[PDB]
Amino acid sequence: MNLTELKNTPVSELITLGENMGLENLARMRKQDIIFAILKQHAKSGEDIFGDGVLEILQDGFGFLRSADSSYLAGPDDIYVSPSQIRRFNLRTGDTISGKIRPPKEGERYFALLKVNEVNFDKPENARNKILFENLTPLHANSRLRMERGNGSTEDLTARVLDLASPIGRGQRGLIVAPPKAGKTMLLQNIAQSIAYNHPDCVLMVLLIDERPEEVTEMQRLVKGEVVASTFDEPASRHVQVAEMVIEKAKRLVEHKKDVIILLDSITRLARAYNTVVPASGKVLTGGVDANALHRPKRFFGAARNVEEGGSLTIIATALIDTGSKMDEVIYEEFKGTGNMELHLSRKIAEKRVFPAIDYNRSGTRKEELLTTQEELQKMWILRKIIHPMGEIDAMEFLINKLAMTKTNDDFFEMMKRS
Amino acid sequence: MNLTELKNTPVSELITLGENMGLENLARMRKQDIIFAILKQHAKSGEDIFGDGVLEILQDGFGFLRSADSSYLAGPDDIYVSPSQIRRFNLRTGDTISGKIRPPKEGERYFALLKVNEVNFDKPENARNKILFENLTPLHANSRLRMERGNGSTEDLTARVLDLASPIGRGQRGLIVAPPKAGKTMLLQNIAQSIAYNHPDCVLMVLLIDERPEEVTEMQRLVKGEVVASTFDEPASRHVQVAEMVIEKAKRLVEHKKDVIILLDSITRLARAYNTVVPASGKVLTGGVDANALHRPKRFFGAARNVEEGGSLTIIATALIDTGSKMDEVIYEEFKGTGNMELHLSRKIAEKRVFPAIDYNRSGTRKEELLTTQEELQKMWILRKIIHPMGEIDAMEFLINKLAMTKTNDDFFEMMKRS
Amino acid sequence: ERPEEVTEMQRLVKGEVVASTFDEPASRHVQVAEMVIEKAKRLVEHKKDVIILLDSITRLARAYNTVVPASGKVLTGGVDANALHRPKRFFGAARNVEEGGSLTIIATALIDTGSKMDEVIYEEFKGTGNMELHLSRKIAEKRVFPAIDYNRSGTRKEELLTTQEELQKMWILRKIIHPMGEIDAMEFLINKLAMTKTNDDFFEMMKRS
Amino acid sequence: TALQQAFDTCQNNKAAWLQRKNELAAAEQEYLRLLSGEGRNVSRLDELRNIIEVRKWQVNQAAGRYIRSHEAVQHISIRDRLNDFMQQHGTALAAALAPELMGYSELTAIARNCAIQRATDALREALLSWLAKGEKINYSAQDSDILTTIGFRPDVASVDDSREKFTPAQNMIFSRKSAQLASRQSV
Ligand SMILES: Nc1ncnc2c1ncn2[C@@H]1O[C@H](COP(=O)(O)OP(=O)(O)OP(=O)(O)O)[C@@H](O)[C@H]1O
Ligand SMILES: Nc1ncnc2c1ncn2[C@@H]1O[C@H](COP(=O)(O)OP(=O)(O)OP(=O)(O)O)[C@@H](O)[C@H]1O
Ligand SMILES: [Mg+2]
Ligand SMILES: [Mg+2]
């Protein structure tokens, strides 16, 4: 068989089929151990097995190959890759690999690679002639992503007002400022599913770090696209490793003319993990945070750009404020104006039973002219001018009850001027 | 010979039984030595001997069976088990094993096991075929837990406000942010006794860390459910090992379709023990906490979850604040977002002779809309809206003077909404 | 302690007092402390009430730390886990026996001595006792003694120790003395109770004048 | 026949309250004997004061429980007597207050409650006549003897000690005092 179908199955049928084929008392061990034993038995039987995953290289070329479904766990099922084929094919970290896998022999405990049939959904020789991500020229978000599904979903409202507040374009830098208990997770999953529905072509990735396991599994269930999530149980080292793996996979994939967007929940937690994972540089910013450590999140957050040659990498991230700690405000101030698109969430607007809890007056976008049309831009700026004089309570409730009396956004666009 | 009640019973009848056959002067050594001596004397006469315990494996398979009622002390009464039978009958850490016990021979001083007649409170045949706890997919809380006893007891009043403050659900990580002198101990034992008196089917466990012996024995003689209390006597090694063994036992019990609720007090002391027991990793955070000193508490606290089928494990832990220690502050800060519900024990409420000290405006719950009925849900919402504006002292007074005069929670709702 | 204090105590106290100056090494202190605590344990085993005054826990812990073998894990300030576990057995004997006898331990601790490990082990000893009272340098500077701080001091579960009316008196005193500062409240209470004869008379003259 | 059980409960509550009263008196007398006994004994004096405090608290609790049992006995006797009398003379007083109860029949809840309260005030005005003239009346002869045993309302000795009220915290701490008293008395 292949690792692809083995990984994405509940352990029930897996253990039943393992018992039917017959390995051992295969109940009391890890799922990765069960998969390893099944693969060992199948290899001993004599049938060839395919393999696929995402490749990473250590500091000495000791290459590993992990799987996205298992959240890049360092289990025994990871494929070993020697530096020989790494140099022969001139591959690096983040290159998706698939091909024949060599069963392990004596002296090693990891499955090896016989041959690779394709790399990053492309031929091994064709993908070699590609330039690095940093060699491209950034450009503004020319294309427009619309969150309106068009089916008039009753829960689509949170997305609709977003198009009326912050237009979304490919290759932009998105940041979200949200206090705790602001309904940001549901908004993010709504955005992800709207993107998957309206734009099935673009590759969707959702990254979760140090989140609750229930949130992780509901992200897995709800999102049709693949979602990578590392919980808080593992130390910050694994969070750093998985974040680097995801960002480098996105960088390697965008060169194949793929529009890739990735979620970041949250930038503050990733920055904290970077701060607590790196050694002290001798200079510490006030409060107890290393200034040098903040260089690491930028590498993750500075890749949001649009490429004229093709492809567009988009980073949409959320940030935490008023959490009671001092780190969150320091991270917010560090990432104050580093992104070209920001969306504000507020707590007082959330505690009055109106959602989404978007602060329309403060939240905004940059370079809307080249991103959307003209007349719609003028009409929405007129709407913003109407919203501005009043506060956030009346404006938000008014917008919510006005967007609920019709279905089509175009119909809403043609009703305020008539009255 | 069902050594359970032999260990449970006090020392007077044990001394009389030991002196029945004139076993020298056994009123001087430890209880474990007395039990070992009487067990060897009964075994030497040829009668069959039975024993039960909780399994903990060493680094070489030299497994030990500890006694729950002995506070998991590493005394001579622990039952030795060989790796061979562990592999044959599929034994793991935290499992409960009962059966025939082999008398020791020359070369060893610990009782072995002849044949186990029960493991994990069911047949050993189907016990070996069980799914690991971490392999089960987590979910959100589904079953509501009512802290109200319903008998209108004056002691239940505080529990009543708990149902009005934050509902308790299965697989819910609960935080009790309680500074010293906040009345959390009797609140915790009230919660435990309410759970025992309202949900006898659900397995109730209480965990005490480095607590004074008087409180330990008060808890032991108060709650009918069994309580594990690592006292203030032993060093951090025993605390961390007993915490690991009890959490493994809880996982093993919940793997068998059993609901388990564990109360812990306090998580700050457990984190302190983990920090002082972990070897230095070379990266020290502010407050003298290692970079890996949080891995163990995070892994312990993230265990609680609601599985897709079977029993659920729920952890309620108490965290201290304003103790004058910076590491307490940092562990509380890193433990803020890891729980889906928390109650604040406001200090200012304590000195006003109004109890329980609940900062109702600050405290809250998450995902409660999918837990309770929508009618009482919106009733709680309007109650929260009513209580939100005014201060904590007067809100607590207004809640107490009207909840004490009524009978039950729904009666309180009816009387407050009729006026 | 110095020989002066131990000699004046032994010539001033009524019951027998165990003492050991610093002229002897730390091992002498360790052995005398352990033998005293186990002797008191035996005395309370024989259903006899025994009270142990400890002065001071910080110095005893320091001696234990200096004498304990290193287990390879040393905390900040040159303190080991066993270095604090050894004095823990001496300090944790305070408990009550329901069928007869009692073993009460009252101990003093040193802070602001110029060594940070002193306050570290004080913090480790912050939540181990059910009764605490502090002494402030500034209160003693004003030459008013004892330099006790009423707001800071407290007793855990003092309701069971005293009666209801004494509890009411204690808590009305708490409410009266809590708002104002420490030195002014201390001098006010000491001068208002100085003219009295007994505590009950003071309570009676303050409750309704 | 639950009236007999209620009467027995009231009687044993009264006996327990009398036991509490006499033991409290014994504690008070021994305490006052020790007051003039001299020789300090501060710990003994404090423990005896705690003993007498818990004794008087449990005396108050027993008196309150006895009063509650007595009033429950009165209520059950009243309801049983009224039930049997209504089964004996229902029609006469049903026709005395006829029109409201005849129009009652089947109506809405508000109308039914209004009719019930109209009947209650009508019978109040009816009973006011004998409330004014008020000749002497004795207990029902069927079960007078039990009513003879309880007689009138509970005596002043059972109510003079129930004047004060205790907050739930007081109840909890005094229950702890009683529990430790029992634990130390058992040994
Ligand atoms: N439109 C809405 N209708 C009903 N409930 C809503 C709506 N928007 C938000 N909520 C409520 O807001 C709550 C906030 O929980 P949620 O998990 O979404 O928070 P978050 O802002 O993502 O952050 P965190 O999970 O860290 O608290 C949800 O439990 C949900 O019940
Ligand atoms: N419902 C209540 N009614 C009356 N008193 C209460 C109530 N709840 C708490 N208290 C008081 O709160 C005090 C707190 O004592 P306790 O030692 O148990 O507190 P804790 O919060 O567990 O913390 P710590 O043990 O560190 O002091 C108790 O002595 C008790 O008098
Ligand atoms: Mg969220
Ligand atoms: Mg406590």
What's the per-residue H, E or C state across B391-415?
CHHHHHHHHHHHHCCCCCHHHHHHH
Kindly give the interhelix angle for A157-165 and A184-198, rounded to the nearest 10 degrees: 90
Interface present between B and A (3 or more CB pairs within 8 Å): yes
Level-2 CATH architecture, domain C1-207: 3-Layer(aba) Sandwich (3.40)
Q: Please give the full DSSP string across B104-133, using - where no structure is assigned.
A: P-TT--S-EEEEEEEETTB-HHHHSS---T
Which residue of D46, D170, D184 is in closest CB contact with C164? D170
> Which residues of chain C neighbour B180 with C-beta distances below 8 Å?
127
Type of residue found at C79: V
Do C99 and C44 contact (CB within 8 A), yes or no? Answer: no
**d(C-alpha A7, C-alpha A13), whole Å:** 12
Residue found by looking up tokens 């030195």 in the block: C183
Residue of D24, D111, D118 lying closest to D62 (CA atoms): D24
Q: Measure the CA–CA gap between D185 and A332, rounded to whole angstroms.
A: 66
Q: What are phi and psi of C31, to 5 degrees?
A: -65, -40
For a substitution probing ligand 2, which of B186, B211, B214 has the most ligand atoms within 8 Å of its CB?
B186
The span from the first CA to the last CA of chain D, in angstroms, equals 41
B270: tokens are: 């457990």
Ligand 2 binding residues, C-beta < 6 A: B 158, 178, 180-186, 355-356; C 156-157, 159; D 169
**What is the rounded distance in angstroms from the CA atom of residue B91 to the CA atom of residue A123?**
49
Residue of D nearest to B356 (CA): D169
Domain range annotation of chain D: 1-187
D116 phi/psi in degrees, rounded to 5: -65, -45
Do residues D67 and D9 lie in contact, with contact meaning Cβ atoms separated by under 8 Å?
A: no
Local structure of residue A80 (DSSP, 8 states): E
CA–CA separation, C112 vs C117, rounded Å?
Answer: 10
Helices (H), A255-294: 267-277
3-state secondary structure of B52: strand
C-alpha A272 – ligand 3 centre gap (Å): 18
A191 with A359: CB under 8 angstroms?
Answer: no
Find out whether the peptide bond into B419 is cis, omega within 30 degrees of 0.
Answer: no
Q: How far apart are CA C176 and CA C192, in angstroms?
A: 13
Alpha helices (H) in A138-179, listed in sequence order: 157-165
> B384 CB near a chain A CB, below 8 Å?
no
How was this structure determined? It was done by cryo-EM
Radius of gyration of chain C (CA): 20
- Using an 8 Å Cβ cutoff, are A318 and A264 in contact? yes
Q: Are strands A203-211 and A259-265 parallel, antiparallel or unpaired?
A: parallel
Separation between Cα atoms, residue C53 and residue C17, nearest integer Å: 10
Report, in angstroms and rounded to the nearest whole number, the Rg of chain B calculated over CA atoms. Answer: 24
* C48 in Cβ contact with C35 (< 8 Å): no
Tokens of A164: 């009326």
Ligand 4 centroid–CA C154 distance in Å is: 14
Name the architecture of domain D1-187.
Up-down Bundle (1.20)
For residue B352, the tally of other CB atoms under 10 A from its CB is 14
The answer to the question of whether C2 is labelled as a binding residue is yes
Task: Evaluate the CA torsion angle B89, B92, B97, B99 in order and state its sign.
Answer: positive
Tokens of B261: 């609720």
Q: For residue B409, how far is the Cα from the chain centroid? A: 27
Q: Give the separation between CA A300 and CA A313, rounded to whole angstroms.
A: 11
A36 neighbors A42 (Cβ within 8 angstroms) = no
- In DSSP notation, A90-110 reads T--TT-EEEEEEEPP-TT--S
Q: Whose CA is nearest to atom 12 of ligand 2?
A: B183
Estimate to the nearest angstrom the gap between the alpha carbon of A391 and the chain centroid. Answer: 34
> What is the three-state SS of C60-79?
HHHHHHHHCCCCCCEECCCE
Residues of B in contact with C92 (CB under 8 A): 212-213, 232-233
As a whole number of angstroms, the distance between CA C190 and CA D127 comes to 68
φ, ψ at B340 (rounded to 5°) = -90, -5
Q: For the domain A129-417, what is the CATH code?
A: 3.40.50.300
H or E stretch covering B7: helix B3-8
Q: Which two tokens stand for residue A288?
A: 């107890």
Q: Does D171 touch chain B (CB under 8 A)?
A: yes
Touching status, chains B and C (3+ beta-carbon pairs under 8 Å): yes
Whether B220 has its CB under 8 Å from any CB of chain C: the answer is: no
Q: How far is CA C86 from CA C34, C69, C80, in A?
A: 10, 11, 10
User: Which chain B residue is nearest to residue A218, measuring alpha carbons?
Assistant: B139
A66 Cβ below 6 A of ligand 1: no
Are C41 and C34 in contact by the 8 Å Cβ rule? The answer is no
How far apart CA A51 and CA A28 sit, in angstroms, is 26
Structure tokens at B155: 């002691």
Length of chain B as a residue count: 419
Q: Do C123 and B212 touch (CB under 8 A)?
A: no
Q: What are phi and psi of A65, to 5 degrees?
A: -135, 115
**List of E strands, B223-377:** 227-231, 260-265, 284-285, 289-290, 306-307, 313-319, 341-344, 364-365
**Non-local CB neighbours of B5 within 8 Å, separated by 6+ positions:** none
Q: Which residue has the tokens 């006792």?
A: C129
| Closest ligand to Cα B183 | 2
Packing angle between helix C164-177 and helix D168-186, nearest 10 degrees?
A: 140
How would you classify the pairing of strands B112-119 and B96-102? antiparallel
Helix and strand element counts for chain D (H, E): 6, 0
Rounded Cα gap, residues B118 and B52, in angstroms: 9
Q: What is the largest CA-CA distance in chain A?
A: 81
Question: How many whole angstroms separate alpha carbon B223 and alpha carbon B189?
Answer: 7
Residue nearest to atom 3 of ligand 1 (CA): A355
DSSP H or E run through D123: helix D109-133
Buried b (16+ CB within 10 A) or exposed e, A118-134: ebbeeebeebeeeeebe
SS3 A56: strand
Three-state SS at D131: helix
Instruction: For residue B257, give every residue at least 6 positions away whose Cβ sits within 8 Å of its Cβ, in sequence order, or none.
Output: B309, B310, B311
Q: What angle do CA B2, B7, B10 make, to 5 degrees?
A: 130
- Which value, to the nearest 10 degrees, does the dihedral of the CA atoms of residues A390, A395, A396, A400 take? 180
- D167 Cβ contact list (under 8 Å, min separation 6): none
Distance CA D103, CA A233 (A): 73
Token digits of residue A222: 């709800």
CB contact under 8 A, C81 and B213: no
C96: chain D residues, CB-CB within 8 Å? none
Q: How far is CA D173 from the centre of its chain?
A: 25
Residue ranges of domains in chain B: 1-126, 129-417
Q: How far apart are CA A162 and CA A345, in angstroms?
A: 12
> What CATH number does the domain located at B1-126 have?
2.40.50.140
Q: Which chains touch C (3 or more CB pairs under 8 A)?
A: B, D
Q: Alpha-carbon distance A115 to A372, whole Å?
A: 47
B128 vs A27, A214, A325: nearest CB = A27
Instruction: Output the six-digit token pair for A382.
Output: 């007129």
Q: Which of A156, A176, A181 to mutate to test the pocket of ligand 1 (most atoms within 8 A of CB)?
A: A181
Q: Which residue from C109, C115, C158 is spatially nearest to C134, judged by alpha carbons?
A: C109
d(CA B192, CA A275): 40
- Residue B405 CA to residue B416 CA, distance in Å, equals 12
CA B311 to chain centre: 16
B190 in Cβ contact with B388 (< 8 Å): no
What is the identity of the amino acid at C88? Answer: K
For tokens 């390879």, what's the residue?
A: C72
CA A5 and chain centroid, separation: 23
Q: Which candidate, C126, D21, A329, A73, places its Cα nearest to that of B232?
A: C126
Distances (CA, A) of C113 to C59, C116, C120, C137, C139: 11, 8, 12, 12, 17
**Sole residue written with tokens 């005893």:** C60
B329 contacts B319 by C-beta, under 8 angstroms: no
Give the amino acid at B128.
R
The amino acid at residue B118 is: E
Peptide bond into B356 cis (omega under 30): yes
Q: Alpha-carbon torsion B188, B192, B194, B195, what sign? A: positive
At A37 the three-state DSSP class reads helix
Determine contact, residues B167/B144, Cβ cutoff 8 Å: yes
Q: Can you read off the two tokens belonging to residue C90? A: 């001496």
D43 three-class SS: helix
DSSP state letter for C148:
B
Confirm whether residue A172 is marked as ligand binding: yes
Q: Locate all alpha helices (DSSP H) within B255-335, ordered by sequence.
A: 267-277, 295-301, 326-334
B29: how many CB neighbours lie within 10 A of its CB? 12
The alpha carbon of residue C164 is apart from the nearest alpha carbon of chain D, in Å, by 8
Q: B367 in ligand 1 pocket by Cβ < 6 Å?
A: yes
Measured in angstroms, the resolution is 3.9
- Residue for token digits 């340098």? C137
| Spatial distance between the Cα atoms of D32 and D42, rounded to a whole number of angstroms | 14
Contacts with B237 from chain C: Cβ below 8 Å: 81
Helices (H) and strands (E) in chain C, counts: 9, 7
d(CA C65, CA C79): 6
Which of B206, B61, B67, B140 is CA-nearest to residue B372? Answer: B140
How many angstroms separate the CA atoms of A213 and A230, rounded?
9
- Binding positions of B for ATP are 169-174, 181-186, 212
Decide: C29 and C61 in contact? Cβ < 8 Å: no
In Å, the largest CA–CA distance within chain C is 64
CB contacts, 8 Å: C49 with chain D:
none
Please report, as a single letter, which amino acid is at residue A64: F
The CA-to-CA distance between both ends of chain C, in Å, stands at 46
Residue nearest to atom 16 of ligand 1 (CA): A183
Going by C-alpha positions, the residue among A13, A3, A81 that lies closest to residue A49 is A3
Question: What is the dihedral angle through the alpha carbons of B388, B393, B395, B398, rounded to the nearest 10 degrees?
Answer: -170
CA dihedral B40, B45, B46, B48 (to 10 degrees): -50
DSSP D45-99: HHHHHHHHHHHHHHHHHHHHHHHHHHHHHHHHHHHHHHHHHHHHHHHHHHHHTHH
DSSP one-letter string for A21-32: H--SSTTSS-HH
Largest Cα span, chain D: 82
Distance between CA atoms of B328 and A414, rounded to whole angstroms?
A: 58
The residue whose C-alpha atom lies closest to atom 20 belonging to ligand 2 is B183
- Whether A212 lines ligand 1, by a CB cut-off of 6 Å, is no
* A183 ligand 1 Cβ < 6 A: yes
Q: Which two tokens stand for residue B219?
A: 């808890």
The residue type found at B376 is E
Which tokens is A375 given? 């007349």
The alpha carbon of residue A45 and the mean position of all alpha carbons in its chain are separated, in whole angstroms, by 39
Q: Are A108 and A85 in contact (CB under 8 A)?
A: no
Indicate which residue's Cα is closest to atom 12 of ligand 1. A183
Q: What is the CA(B218)–ligand 2 centre distance, in A?
A: 14
Query: What whole-number distance in Å separates Cα of residue C175 and Cα of residue C167?
Result: 12
Region class of A210: left (phi > 0), else alpha (psi between -120 and 50), else beta: left
Joined tokens for residue D149 = 């045993």
Tell me if residue B254 falls in helix, strand or coil.
Answer: helix
| B12 Cβ neighbours under 8 A, 6+ residues apart | none
Tell me the C-alpha distance between B311 and A42, whole Å.
Answer: 35
Bridge partner residues of C155 (DSSP): C131
Distance CA A228, CA A263 (A): 10
A227: CB partners within 8 A, 6+ apart = A205, A206, A207, A208, A219, A220
Neighbours of chain A (3+ CB pairs under 8 A): B
